[PDB]
Design an enzyme around this catalytic site. Structure first.
Site, PDB file in Angstrom:
ATOM      1  N   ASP A  76       0.826  -1.194   0.000  1.00  0.00           N
ATOM      2  CA  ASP A  76       0.000   0.000   0.000  1.00  0.00           C
ATOM      3  C   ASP A  76       0.868   1.256   0.000  1.00  0.00           C
ATOM      4  OD1 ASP A  76      -1.790   2.173   0.799  1.00  0.00           O
ATOM      5  OD2 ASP A  76      -3.225   0.559   1.154  1.00  0.00           O
ATOM      6  N   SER A  86      -7.250   4.210  -0.906  1.00  0.00           N
ATOM      7  CA  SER A  86      -7.002   2.770  -0.771  1.00  0.00           C
ATOM      8  C   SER A  86      -8.233   1.930  -1.062  1.00  0.00           C
ATOM      9  CB  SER A  86      -6.545   2.459   0.654  1.00  0.00           C
ATOM     10  OG  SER A  86      -5.295   3.058   0.891  1.00  0.00           O
ATOM     11  N   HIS A  91       2.636   8.828   4.562  1.00  0.00           N
ATOM     12  CA  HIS A  91       1.808   9.906   5.085  1.00  0.00           C
ATOM     13  C   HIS A  91       2.552  10.702   6.136  1.00  0.00           C
ATOM     14  CE1 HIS A  91      -1.967   9.367   3.054  1.00  0.00           C
ATOM     15  NE2 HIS A  91      -2.027   8.087   3.387  1.00  0.00           N
TER      16      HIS A  91
HETATM   17 MG   LIG Z   1      -4.098  -0.654   2.735  1.00  0.00          MG
HETATM   18 ZN   LIG Z   2      -3.484   2.831  -0.200  1.00  0.00          ZN
HETATM   19 ZN   LIG Z   3      -2.999   6.507   2.485  1.00  0.00          ZN
END
Ligand SMILES: [Mg+2]
Ligand SMILES: [Zn+2]
Ligand SMILES: [Zn+2]
Ligand SMILES: [Mg+2]
Ligand SMILES: [Mg+2]
Ligand SMILES: [Mg+2]
Ligand SMILES: [Zn+2]
Ligand SMILES: [Zn+2]
Lengths: 346, 346
Positions: free
Chosen positions: B14, B55, B234
């Site tokens: 991610d 996401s 982030h």
């Molecule tokens: Mg995720």
């Molecule tokens: Zn993501």
């Molecule tokens: Zn994010």
């Protein structure tokens, strides 16, 4: 057992990481020519002495097949000259050309025809042109040939080496067809930016190179550079960066259009490194009290550095032998892979 | 005509753009498992309504094969529930598993087993697990099952659905081999960071999933997520991001080692989007009369945003049908390509 390309076109977008490439999918009218590619690889770009490469070692990796020190032009880590792909092409009866939007003496083009200890030796590089095997070139840099600190007229030396030189404008094929070699020096230093009206120079000059070098059913090697993408990155100037890479994608379309018609041509597209940390961030909106918040609906390009970065770089390949360029490898393997698929004598 | 894989392992990092991936080539001991891949593609990640994806829509593109709105979980742009790869797999007698380092209710895993109008509805998502076809899961999120606004005991419900649940620790395979379905809820919210000692959970859980789901020679589909790479981005926290993606690369190795021995397993590695504008910039030094300058010999990671970005994202594939994943395409085609090569039907 891969097919063997007769011709090779190597297009280099200076300073274009995957983020820069991605901008063509958002800031260009119509679909990017990038989407024509299936075979994709990734290169690691570090030099022999530095994690973050410069353009000189970066291009020399491609042109000569060795890792070398930042600032090196077609020389190895110990400063000795190394045989380039252009010199190999010449020895295999291959016609060669170099196109650029910078000066023709800038690090990227220079690495394909010169051998110099330092990329800053641009008057030396210009003189090297007169001793090179190149059959065709087009770029800026008239200053390095006709307004030198050593007062020498290198233009005259070029012409005395069988180069027909035009310093006025790009012409059509028929204008130059009967020349043995052809050189276009169309600016004192760098060519104009796109925003200053350079127009379709890169595509037109690449297409001209293709026609000129394929005279008499000859095989050819061409390197064309979208030189100024890097400069947009250094300046942290989004519109500059975007317009330059949009132009580069046009050149890709030109090469690919020829390759698909020809059927015997390998087209390779890559970059020497990334610059600026260009990022397709969310647009920033500003409220009355609360100031700044991110709006994911649209993109507002951001940057994080004024210099190069060490990210891996995408390689795209189309045509006979293009499958050789997939997977992940060192930048200098580009050279060895071109040699491998063409089967030229080293 | 490519081959037909029996099993599929989809590993999702991610928030990892190519720059994040590239960090493993500089900040991890030994060669990254990324280098085992030859077939590479690129995906465009925009949602149905937003240039910059989140996401939820990003993962739903993978799990359900459609563009949908940011925050959507397993629903289309008009909010209608759509069949996920997990549901389709179940129909075709395929065993299924989801592993994450976030809460198991977080957007990415949730998109593979739930259908909700908004990713923030995590107590609803946890309840959706009870009506799901999932055979194996492992991640954080114990709070969503046992400390809920409705005060229901969702673990009891799962157990009535043949789940054995473990809230203590990842166990040896011998501890779970005879269970009908298995779920590990190993933290109240997210799993610890690597920096806080999570260790090899991600690789270990993926291995456990593989052994468990392949019991009795059943075919399987697994999604394992390196969930916290995004959080490192982030926070603009380089060591966090780097340690999380190095862990992810270990999980890639775990999957590839299994797939190479098995010979009937497709491994796909990709990301949902990039975050933070992570850049492997040159180290910055300071003078003391005009401080900052660059040292290209070393890397000093930098960021330009606190949110996601819209760069294209690399896809890596190994195993039967892996060639279907090359070229450049929209993120939601990942779904259709998996169905195409596995021949899993509806
Ligand atoms: Mg995720
Ligand atoms: Zn993501
Ligand atoms: Zn994010
Ligand atoms: Mg250059
Ligand atoms: Mg501007
Ligand atoms: Mg830190
Ligand atoms: Zn460069
Ligand atoms: Zn530069």
């Amino acid at each position: 057992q891969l097919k063997t390309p007769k011709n090779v076109i190597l297009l280099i977008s200076d300073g274009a990481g995957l983020s820069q490439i991605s901008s063509t999918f958002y800031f260009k009218s119509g679909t990017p020519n990038y989407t024509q590619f299936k075979n994709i690889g990734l290169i690691k770009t570090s030099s022999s002495r530095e994690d973050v490469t410069d353009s000189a070692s970066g291009a020399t990796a491609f042109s000569c097949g060795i890792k070398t020190y930042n600032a090196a032009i077609g020389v190895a880590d110990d400063s000795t000259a190394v045989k380039s792909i252009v010199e190999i092409a010449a020895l295999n009866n291959i016609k060669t050309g170099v196109v650029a939007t910078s000066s023709i003496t800038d690090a990227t083009p220079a690495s394909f025809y010169a051998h110099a200890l330092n990329r800053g030796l641009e008057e030396e590089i210009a003189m090297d042109m007169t001793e090179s095997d190149l059959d065709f070139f087009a770029g800026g840099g008239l200053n390095y040939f006709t307004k030198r600190k050593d007062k020498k007229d290198v233009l005259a030396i070029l012409k005395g080496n069988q180069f027909t030189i035009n310093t006025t404008a790009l012409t059509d094929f028929s204008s130059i067809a009967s020349n043995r070699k052809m050189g276009f020096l169309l600016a004192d230093e760098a060519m104009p930016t796109m925003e200053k009206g350079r127009g379709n120079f890169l595509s037109a000059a690449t297409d001209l190179a293709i026609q000129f070098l394929s005279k008499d059913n000859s095989a050819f090697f061409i390197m064309s550079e979208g030189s100024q993408i890097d400069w947009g990155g250094h300046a942290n100037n989004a519109s500059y960066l975007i317009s330059e890479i949009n132009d580069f994608d046009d050149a890709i379309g030109t090469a690919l259009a020829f390759a698909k018609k020809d059927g015997n041509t390998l087209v390779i597209v890559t970059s020497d490194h990334e610059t600026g940390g260009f990022t397709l961030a969310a647009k920033k909106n500003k409220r009355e009290d609360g100031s700044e918040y991110s709006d994911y609906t649209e993109i507002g390009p951001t940057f994080s550095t004024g210099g190069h970065s060490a990210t891996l770089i995408p390689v795209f390949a189309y045509g006979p032998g293009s499958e050789e360029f997939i997977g992940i490898y060192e930048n200098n393997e580009i050279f060895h892979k071109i040699l491998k698929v063409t089967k030229w004598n080293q």
